[PDB]
Amino acid sequence: KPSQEL
Amino acid sequence: TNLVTSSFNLTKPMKSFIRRNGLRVQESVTDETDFVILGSPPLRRTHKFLLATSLGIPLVSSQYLTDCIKSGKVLDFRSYKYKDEEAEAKWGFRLDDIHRRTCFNGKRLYITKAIRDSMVGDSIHGLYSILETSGAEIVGDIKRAQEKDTIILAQPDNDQEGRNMSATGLNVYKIELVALSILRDRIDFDEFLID
């Protein structure tokens, strides 16, 4: 799963 | 020397080089992290990137590791500082601004229920992590947040707590305030005011 962006 | 990777998958040869040359990969960014290796541009505004920025940790291009392998030695990471002028113009910040952020030191923040529910998973975890690492305190309940010493983060629409605070005379702000403020080492409140 991909590191989420904030 | 301690490093973290973000938006980049380490290969087995890279891990071999790291094991043998007194480097260490960390699961998370901390005050002992020496630099963060980022995947190739365009820059992805990940939790790890924002933590590194908040803590004054340099960002380094992935090419570093491959070049290290090709040279047999630990090159100077400084030759490989991350560069992305497009992101700099897009978000209005400087990658060369490497220093511990102070803009959230001593701040009190409240994240509305809408945000807490509507970001299931990493997103909200990164939010809380970044804020507390940056020296902020999260207030315990919306009642305490109903004060002028508190930054309320809300969704612009479909946020009952947000609207209820607005109807007290209190200003509420978009979640982007956190990321961009970290990048700029300054809180541009008006940019993010919800109205």
Numbering used by the authors:
A (entry chain C): 127 to 132
B (entry chain A): 387 to 581
Authors' own words:
Since its discovery, phosphorylation of the most C-terminal serine residue (Ser 139) in the histone H2A variant H2AX has become the definitive biomarker for the presence of DNA double-strand breaks (DSBs) in mammalian cells. Comparable phosphorylations of closely related C-terminal motifs are also observed in both of the yeast species commonly used in genome stability studies, Saccharomyces cerevisiae and Schizosaccharomyces pombe but here the phosphorylation occurs on the normal histone H2A isoform rather than a specialised variant. However, subsequent studies demonstrated that γH2AX is a direct participant in recruitment of repair factors, and interacts directly with MDC1; via specific binding of its C-terminal tetrapeptide incorporating pSer139, to the tandem BRCT domain at the C-terminus of MDC1. This, and the earlier demonstrations of phosphorylation-dependent interactions of BRCA1 and PTIP, highlighted the key role played by BRCT domains in mediating interactions between proteins involved in the DNA damage response. Structural analysis of the Crb2-BRCT2 module revealed a similar mode of interaction with the C-terminal phosphopeptide motif of γH2A as that seen in the interaction of MDC1-BRCT2 with MDC1, allowing the identification of key features in the BRCT2 module that mediate the specificity for the phosphorylated serine and carboxyl-terminus. Critical to the ability of BRCT domains to recognise the phosphorylated status of ligand peptides, are a triplet of amino acids (Ser548, Arg558 and Lys619 in Crb2) which make multiple hydrogen binding and charge-neutralising interactions with the negatively-charged phosphate group of the phosphorylated peptide.
